[PDB]
Amino acid sequence: GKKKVCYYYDGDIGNYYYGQGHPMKPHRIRMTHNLLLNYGLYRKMEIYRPHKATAEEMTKYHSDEYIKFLRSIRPDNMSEYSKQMQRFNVGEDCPVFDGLFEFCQLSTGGSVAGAVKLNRQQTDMAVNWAGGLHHAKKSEASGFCYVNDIVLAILELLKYHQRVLYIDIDIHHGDGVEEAFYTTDRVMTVSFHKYGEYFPGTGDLRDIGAGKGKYYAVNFPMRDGIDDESYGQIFKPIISKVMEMYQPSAVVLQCGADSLSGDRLGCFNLTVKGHAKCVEVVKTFNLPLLMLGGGGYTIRNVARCWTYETAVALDCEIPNELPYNDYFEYFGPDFKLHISPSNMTNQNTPEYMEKIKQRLFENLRMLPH
Amino acid sequence: KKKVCYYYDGDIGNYYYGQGHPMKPHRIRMTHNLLLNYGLYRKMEIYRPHKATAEEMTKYHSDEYIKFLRSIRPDNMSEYSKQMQRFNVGEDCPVFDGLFEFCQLSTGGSVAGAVKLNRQQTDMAVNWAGGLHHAKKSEASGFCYVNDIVLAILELLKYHQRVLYIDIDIHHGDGVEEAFYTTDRVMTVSFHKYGEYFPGTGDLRDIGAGKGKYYAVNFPMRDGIDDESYGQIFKPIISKVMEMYQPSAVVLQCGADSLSGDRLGCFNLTVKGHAKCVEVVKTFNLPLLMLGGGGYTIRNVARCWTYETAVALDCEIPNELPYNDYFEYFGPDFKLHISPSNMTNQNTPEYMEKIKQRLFENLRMLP
């Protein structure tokens, strides 16, 4: 039926600033929140403020040295850390900014708090739009991400759940999550992403995991221009077969919005309804679900996408006409919730999508039963 | 009248799936012997098919799957347990002696038939050892290992812009539908039992994708359909398909597991009700490849396909079976035609009309 949803938000998150010209804008999390307050979605969910996750929590995955660096580095001492910055890949895509460590603590705190709540069966669904930072690695930042809140939340779920399914609909390959779990069968990672001379460079469909994890990493490589009909025709079949073969008892869905049409950095052509169909599909399996944010660089569309996906999580129909809100002028010139696709060419032919699907289905046959 | 080429290899009846397995290639040899005894050989050209090569099979199936089919043997299965799981071979699709050659003969007949139609050397080609519609690019399924129908249609597509595939086996022809699901050059039309039944696919809503949207047609049925209910949906559907799609060749899979008293099927058709489909298709005067399919009550398979060959040849044959090498199998009546059972028809009139009207709406979406 309808589920209990817990939602995490820190009202300070929107003030963190990556720097002039940097495309990652934590302000999109505050726009999302303001928009769903204005639709009245707060009546229907429990809103919690995340704690600041500690270094003890983050070193359940990341190295002590890397977490100590992240605690220590500031724009005023950068000059003393030129060597460490290189080692940990901080200082260009992943800049040093004021309050960097606190931003990581809040992003991480909502994901891990949501995993706790799920483990305690206090909620069916937990939402943390500030999370989803899937590129961070054990000892290095990558792709605007510093601490892998998803890996930490999955580790928390693995205390109570034998098998956890991770699904990643960000336009980029979820490489930090896949690498963390690449040799285990206790997390199956499934990433749909643009592949071919695109960041981060990994996620070929021939990357299937290794050792006990062989067959428990699933990658669906796509080309530019994918649209709702192409996506919707492979996502429900793949996720259904994964559910059937792997039988997870919890699910983590990264809902990166850089896969929408009109994204400043992404090259796909999904609408908000197309993207949100993935949430609807995953919800039908009725498993404990942690939904997380991710990329997304055209901020008016990020706010629309994550507002509508919160409404889907709540089984709540919201009108297309946007309510007035603090960021109303960002949504012009139409002031509607739903977006139109562009006329960009879809380089993903229907035969290509069916062929890749058939190749992954072969691999899913190799799971035990 | 019309010319009929017919394919049969005298070895096909010797392949054996294993003790207890319901698929019996010997039904093909029974069929052939009954038809020879009716004198239907005087009226058609009978050819022994060449064995399809492994290379011909890889026009559709994956190389690793075909190499596996060529390599696996009852005595070596312990070296191939991972590949058996990958390719779904070993249970319902067992490893048996000569498996690969059985696939070469069944495929050979279908492909040879398609070549004869492309060359305009015949009007109709018949391969009762064909019709193995469940096989997939890289997996066996439902007693089928190599999809001879797909390979024959790929061959027709060299010479025909649009090919229509019609499937009256009781099961959804899923391997054929999947092969062509994103093209408009092949329209697949399957009538089948649907609902907690193998293979699980063939929903009314599965209508194709991409350029193939509206070019896959499924008529899902419940248990107990009879000659009258089936014939009142088959003719109008196929007539409207012929009208809207205008194919230049037709492939008809005539799986006989939709007959009353089938060991595995739950339909209530007679031989006449099943063969009415062949008659309807012939009225459109298009190049036609007729293939076999399922059928597990082997005496009724031999009657069905004998009667359908006679329909192909426009020959009325007597209800009294001629003497033949299998005569005792047809006792105690020794008649060609069978009676339906008293099983209940669970397809209500409302149900049938609702499905037919949806399919007509889908057919109106064609250009």
Added chain:
Amino acid sequence: KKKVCYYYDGDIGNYYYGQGHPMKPHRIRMTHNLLLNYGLYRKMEIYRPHKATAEEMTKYHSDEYIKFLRSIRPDNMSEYSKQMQRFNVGEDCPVFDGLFEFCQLSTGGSVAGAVKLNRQQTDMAVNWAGGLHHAKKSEASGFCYVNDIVLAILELLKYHQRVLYIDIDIHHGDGVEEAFYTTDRVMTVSFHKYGEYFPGTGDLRDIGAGKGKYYAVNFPMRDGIDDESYGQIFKPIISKVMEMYQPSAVVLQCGADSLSGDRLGCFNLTVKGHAKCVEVVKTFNLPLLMLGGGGYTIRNVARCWTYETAVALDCEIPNELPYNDYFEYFGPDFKLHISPSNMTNQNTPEYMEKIKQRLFENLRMLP
């Protein structure tokens, strides 16, 4: 195993002839990525070509023409309108950015391969960016600007008294036949479509001049030739040529515009049928330089030259294509091999034998 070295520059795919122009250097990059993903890099030496210098190019081409190619740019075309006319650049051989560098890289691979063959460092050298057989001493023609084949053959003739050139592009190899038409130190053998077709040369009766009389061989064909027909004349012609001429090196231009389905060509060869020519030439165990050539359905050019690279390596590769950077270009079937079309073969069996007999009469006139 015979050793194979293969030339490829990663920038070659970025040269662009302009919107709507059928020649697409990107096909070279597609071919490269397919054979990487088949694993064939493990079996061969892969080199980056040098940029051939003006000094190298003027071993054949006029100084004036090379100086013009090294000067001409989209931004200065206005000032070179008379030279564009003189050198035939600006229409079917357009000016584009990097033109000269593209010529340098295509030529660099063929001349470098010939050097490797002369030094007995390899048995076969492959440059799929080469084969630009229409360029003339002082003019561009037919999308070709620098005749890398003529330059490679001049390098071979430093070490080899007699070099055989074989051209299976659908077009007559006119720039190469012209360069060598009055010498017996190169025999040129071209199979091509002839009759109101580019470049208009290559009649059966063009057999060379002077000391080169009888050292040019032309087999003119009509539309629709297929694998069966082509392979029945290629092997006996080449075998007789090898017997009578006894070359010590061979250059084989493998233009893929002779394939079925080519955007500009009218033949009906499959990848197997085209690649059989490579297998035949290899049976003579002579140093061999294999070069590219035309080909305008770029998915089938990548298939052809990938399979011919495998044939050079004595490697069978599966029909199922591996995943690769351009995998969507190979739908709908995603197989390596292609089917022929239903086009009529206008080359009758008597036509092929009669022309074969006429050529065999000329070959008997050799010492």
